[PDB]
Design a protein around this ligand. Structure first.
Ligand code: PAR
Lengths: 41, 98, 91, 86
RNA sequence: ACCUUGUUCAGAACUUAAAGAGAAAUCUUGAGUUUAUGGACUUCAGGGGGAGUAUGGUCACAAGGCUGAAACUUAAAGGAAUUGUACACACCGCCCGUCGCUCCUACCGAUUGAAUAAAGAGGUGAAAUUCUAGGAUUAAAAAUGGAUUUAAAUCUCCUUAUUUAGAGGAAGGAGAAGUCGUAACAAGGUUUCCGUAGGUGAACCUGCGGAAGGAUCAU
RNA sequence: UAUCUGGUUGAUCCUGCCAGUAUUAUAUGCUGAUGUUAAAGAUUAAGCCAUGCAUGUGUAAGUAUAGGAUGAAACUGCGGACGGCUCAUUAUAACAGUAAUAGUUUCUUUGGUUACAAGGAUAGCUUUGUGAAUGAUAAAGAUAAUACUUGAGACAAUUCAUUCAAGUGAGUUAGGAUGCCACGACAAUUGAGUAACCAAUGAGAAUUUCUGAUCUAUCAAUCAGUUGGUAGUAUCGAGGACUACCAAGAUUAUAACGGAUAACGAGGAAUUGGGGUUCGACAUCGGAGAGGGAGCUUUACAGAUGGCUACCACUUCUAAGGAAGGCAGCAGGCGCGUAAAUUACCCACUUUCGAAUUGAAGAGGUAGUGACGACACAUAUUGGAGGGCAAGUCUGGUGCCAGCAGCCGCGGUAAUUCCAGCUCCAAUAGUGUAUAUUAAAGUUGCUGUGAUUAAAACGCUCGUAGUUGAAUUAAUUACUUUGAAUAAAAUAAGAAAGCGAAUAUUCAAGCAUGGGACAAUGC
RNA sequence: UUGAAAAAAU
RNA sequence: CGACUUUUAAUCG
């Protein structure tokens, strides 16, 4: 390890870079519990 | 000098061990001062009475089982009576009449 | 083998068959330290086309500081110690 | 180590001392005495008291005491189980 | 007994399939019961070349067999189908091998080819210690001598990795239009291919024996 | 998000790979308004080091004419064996978990027990000096001790031989008794200090039990102190650890012995539908090292190297006779390389050491550089416009040339791909490029692949090891269920952050337990 | 009975 | 040098 202080990522870029059905829907900039529900169901 | 660790011996299969460190003081060995009385500062500060040579001896009521060559070194179990103390460690010869 | 106690063969079988892998083997045997001009490094400081395409590719020959081997290097753009870093395809 | 250790690290300190992980690089080393390093402090962890394992902080009365000559012996308390030393 | 019928096994096959499987050709006594994925076990394969080549090991009298890489090179190579077809610019097609010309890569290497860095046995051996002798000095105790122990450092043969090497070389690979032939794809004009042996500028040719992936499922 | 798309053909369906994609961490190209957090000479050279600091310490209670408390120096005491750095070693070695020490054990701390004072010398003090000088040393004259001794107020534990003998699963065991040896006190101390022993601290240190590691047969046989036995030695202590005698034994296809690593191991990290693959020098635990070996000193602990000694290899001062040193501590210089910051301040946090509440600490904190990264957040760049893949069938030149293109390919004078100009496309203070890890990859297959023709069933049979082995019955092991026990950090969990979660892990082993259907071992 | 060949890319 | 061809490659003077 390198540091005692924790850190996290607050987003994840999509797998497919260019898809029209996503460019329109998403359009300042373009910058969990479902599975938690899943595991108990 | 003399070490007593098993880092230089082989394995039960005959393998040669490979060095990963150097000699450490906790494996100290010492030159056997044959009792044909000094003191040695052992670990933890205790003292060992190293009897270099000695002739008198307490006993209670010609042959060495280990090495015939020793026949006049004084060691435990030697016949002279049979010595029962460790003269090289305790610093005196204590034996019993056969 | 499929039985419950035959974990020795399938472990052994897989180890043998991995060596057939061109990509996997290249990363384990000793050529990335003696045959790769770049070694394992990214960049390296140093000092006519195929049939259906005609023209001339301007290129350069470079002797590496560390290894000393001579390699052919392209020039990036139109009309274009040197740092060389591979191409699109790896190796 | 050439000799007995003197310093103590914050992380290596016992859990129940409740020391934070960012307060300071070191933690106070308990001196030798009547209580051990991990059994002292320089249910959140006859009728008896649990000082050891998972039952630490629990009070109650013993029902029976299985004994195994091999390794240890077990105490059952009104019910939870734990070794004698706890 | 031999022939004609039934019944139940073992064996070599064959016919049909609207079914099952497959990329299809086809398979059906499996190539079925496989994404609805697991009956038991052994062996082999991982794009095409370089290559069954180099090195090393081993077997044979030898030819050779068995085990067997890497460097480097390249976007395809290949399968089954839309009388045979490797053709689709469609035979005025495609394609093979030697040679000629540049460049690159590994291999060998008369030049006792070396050279360097790391591992065991034998010889020399510092120093410090254990013991011993000595006791200048003021029982203690320093120089010093001697014998053990532990042994650095060095020399001699031998065991792993990294490097320099020219006659002497010998292979492979890449680059539109360079030579000689017609080897292969149609019966490719001598059907083709495999093993082996011999000959030959080159594809290759011929002998012995197989195979159809044959141009014959057939008298 | 359990996901694919371009490319072999005139066209089709495959095998199969290349390419495309996302991500993690390294470098790097262009560009940059803030606030918070934060990596940072490891890879290449455990290569070489200029310079400065990193370990010293004083209370009423040791010694002080340098007697009021105070009081520098010096003697004496304690520590520098912790801390900090690095990962060169190392392949059952170290390490992790578990078990033992009825086979050892101090230091500190804590609890308990057991002669109205004697004797001398020594530094600082003063004096003489010496050589260039080291943390340089020589002479002489004094003076103290909680320095060094003797000495008494009166035992404690070691060795030996014999004997009586109660905890523990288990002891001729703790312990008592007999005779002997050894050692021998509770400072002849100071305004608190001390010796011997017992216990704890101690689950600790150290040895040791069981299980567990990457690739390799172009490593198949290996070992002679080797394997065991006796007796001694040596050790803090078990033991071939060693010596003498005796024996022929130990390991191996369930991979021994040997070889490679760009190998310190673990807690962990990256990525994952499940399963897995790769990394872990680097916060914390353990190990090892201080240029290379080796030999030692002091102590309670060192085979110490900011201690010594010798050799090898270097570095430095020199008045030329001599002299010291070990940055893989903090800064910093070179060399190396693609690849890594200040020759800053202070003990104020945390903690440690000290004769101690004060002193010291390049541990530690603060400040500096710092698009490594992460979180929030102004208003401008990066690449691209044929397809994959979102975006122009706009205008000028170039003419298979220059060039672009990760792949398909575009360019041979009318280019949707070149060089320009305009416009819009994705993201945005970020975005290109190269390399490598993972997913894609059901292209490594336990879940899960294929083997007629695409790569791939040994020419065939026998056969050892291995694996797999029909039905049937009213001691272990495997299996299975529960517990015990189980460092933190981290993971998940009760703006990134931070701080009491039952917080659950965390497997491989090991312990206890209910069960005996499917199994293996002999009876 | 003989019967060889067709420069590179669109 | 030109001629040739969609370009080239050669060829022909
Ligand atoms: N690939 C290695 C071997 O090459 C052999 O032969 C090689 C050459 O001898 C052969 O040469 C051909 C020639 O056949 C044909 N008749 C003429 C053609 N110009 C040559 O071509 C070759 O050489 C020229 C030289 O300028 C290069 O520019 C060209 O790129 C290259 N292919 O082309 C091959 C590639 O260099 C066998 N043809 C081949 O089967 C084998 O694989």
């Amino acid at each position: 390890g390198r540091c005692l202080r924790n850190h996290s990522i607050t987003y994840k870029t999509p797998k497919v870079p260019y898809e029209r059905e996503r460019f329109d829907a998403e359009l300042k900039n373009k910058k969990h519990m479902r599975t938690i529900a899943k595991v108990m169901l | 000098g003399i070490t007593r660790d098993s880092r230089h011996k082989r394995r039960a299969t005959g393998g040669k061990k490979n060095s990963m460190q150097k000699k450490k003081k906790n494996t100290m060995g010492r030159q056997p001062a044959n009792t044909r009385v000094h003191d040695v500062r052992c670990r933890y500060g205790i003292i060992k009475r190293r009897a270099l040579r000695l002739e008198n001896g307490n006993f209670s009521w010609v042959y060495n089982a280990s090495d015939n060559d020793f026949v006049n070194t004084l060691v435990k179990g030697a016949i002279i009576a049979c010595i029962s103390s460790r003269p090289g460690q305790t610093g005196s010869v204590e034996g019993y009449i056969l | 083998a499929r039985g419950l106690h035959a974990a020795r063969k399938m472990l052994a079988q897989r180890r043998a068959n991995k060596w057939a892998d061109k990509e996997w083997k290249k990363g384990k045997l000793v050529t990335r330290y003696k045959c790769n001009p770049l070694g394992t490094a990214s960049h390296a400081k140093g000092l006519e086309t195929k049939q259906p395409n005609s023209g001339i590719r301007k290129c350069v020959r470079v002797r590496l500081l560390k290894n000393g081997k001579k390699i052919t290097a392209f020039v990036p753009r139109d009309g274009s110690e040197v740092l060389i870093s591979g191409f699109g395809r790896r190796g | 180590a050439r000799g007995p250790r003197h310093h103590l690290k914050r992380l290596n300190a016992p859990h129940h001392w409740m020391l934070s992980k960012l307060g300071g690089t070191f933690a106070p080393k308990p001196s030798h005495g009547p209580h051990g390093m991990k059994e002292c402090l320089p249910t959140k962890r006859n009728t008896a008291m649990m000082i050891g394992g998972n039952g630490m902080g629990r009070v109650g009365v013993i029902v029976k005491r299985e004994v195994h000559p091999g390794s240890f012996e077990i105490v059952h308390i009104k019910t939870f189980t734990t070794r004698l030393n706890n």
